[PDB]
Coordinates of N, CA, C and O in Angstrom, one line a residue:
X1 N 58.4 99.0 -31.7 CA 58.1 97.9 -30.8 C 58.9 97.9 -29.5 O 59.8 98.7 -29.2
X2 N 58.5 96.9 -28.6 CA 59.1 96.8 -27.3 C 57.9 97.1 -26.3 O 56.8 96.8 -26.4
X3 N 58.4 97.7 -25.1 CA 57.5 97.9 -24.0 C 57.9 99.0 -23.0 O 58.9 98.8 -22.2
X4 N 57.3 100.2 -23.2 CA 57.7 101.4 -22.5 C 57.0 102.6 -23.1 O 55.9 102.5 -23.7
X5 N 57.5 103.9 -22.8 CA 56.9 105.1 -23.3 C 57.3 105.4 -24.8 O 58.1 104.7 -25.4
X6 N 56.7 106.5 -25.4 CA 57.3 107.2 -26.6 C 57.0 106.3 -27.9 O 57.1 105.1 -27.9
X7 N 56.6 107.0 -29.0 CA 56.1 106.2 -30.1 C 57.3 105.6 -30.9 O 58.4 106.0 -31.0
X8 N 56.9 104.5 -31.7 CA 57.9 103.5 -32.2 C 58.8 104.2 -33.2 O 60.0 103.9 -33.4
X9 N 58.2 105.2 -34.0 CA 58.9 105.9 -35.1 C 59.8 107.0 -34.6 O 60.4 107.7 -35.5
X10 N 60.1 107.0 -33.3 CA 61.2 107.9 -32.8 C 62.6 107.3 -33.0 O 63.6 108.0 -33.1
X11 N 62.6 105.9 -33.0 CA 63.9 105.2 -33.0 C 63.9 103.9 -33.9 O 64.9 103.4 -34.3
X12 N 62.7 103.2 -33.9 CA 62.5 102.1 -34.9 C 63.4 100.8 -34.5 O 64.0 100.2 -35.4
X13 N 63.3 100.3 -33.3 CA 64.1 99.1 -32.9 C 63.6 97.8 -33.5 O 62.4 97.6 -33.9
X14 N 64.6 96.8 -33.6 CA 64.4 95.6 -34.2 C 63.6 94.5 -33.3 O 64.0 93.3 -33.2
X15 N 62.4 95.0 -32.8 CA 61.4 94.0 -32.3 C 60.7 93.5 -33.6 O 60.2 94.2 -34.4
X16 N 60.6 92.1 -33.8 CA 59.9 91.5 -34.9 C 58.4 91.1 -34.5 O 57.6 90.8 -35.3
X17 N 58.2 91.0 -33.1 CA 57.0 90.5 -32.6 C 55.8 91.5 -32.5 O 54.6 91.1 -32.4
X18 N 56.2 92.8 -32.5 CA 55.1 93.8 -32.1 C 54.0 93.9 -33.1 O 52.9 94.4 -32.9
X19 N 54.3 93.3 -34.4 CA 53.4 93.4 -35.5 C 52.1 92.6 -35.3 O 51.1 92.8 -36.0
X20 N 52.2 91.6 -34.4 CA 51.0 90.8 -34.0 C 51.0 90.7 -32.4 O 50.3 89.8 -31.9
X21 N 51.5 91.7 -31.7 CA 51.3 91.8 -30.3 C 49.9 92.4 -30.0 O 49.8 93.6 -29.6
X22 N 48.9 91.6 -30.3 CA 47.5 92.1 -30.5 C 46.7 92.5 -29.2 O 45.5 92.4 -29.1
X23 N 47.5 93.1 -28.2 CA 46.9 93.8 -27.1 C 46.9 95.3 -27.5 O 47.6 95.7 -28.4
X24 N 46.2 96.2 -26.7 CA 46.3 97.6 -27.0 C 47.7 98.1 -26.5 O 47.9 98.7 -25.4
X25 N 48.7 97.8 -27.3 CA 50.1 98.0 -26.9 C 51.1 97.8 -28.1 O 52.3 97.5 -28.0
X26 N 50.6 98.2 -29.3 CA 51.5 98.4 -30.5 C 52.0 99.8 -30.5 O 51.4 100.8 -29.9
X27 N 53.1 100.1 -31.2 CA 53.5 101.4 -31.6 C 54.3 102.2 -30.5 O 54.4 103.5 -30.7
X28 N 55.0 101.6 -29.6 CA 55.8 102.3 -28.6 C 57.1 101.4 -28.2 O 57.2 100.3 -28.6
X29 N 58.0 101.9 -27.4 CA 59.3 101.2 -27.2 C 60.1 101.4 -25.9 O 59.7 102.1 -25.0
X30 N 61.2 100.7 -25.8 CA 62.1 100.8 -24.7 C 63.5 100.4 -25.1 O 64.6 100.1 -25.5

């Protein structure tokens, strides 16, 4: 989760919101 480049499973940060951030913008981070 978050908002930036690179897929979420590189680092796995504690964003709780991304799971229903229902724009085409799941699965990446900052």
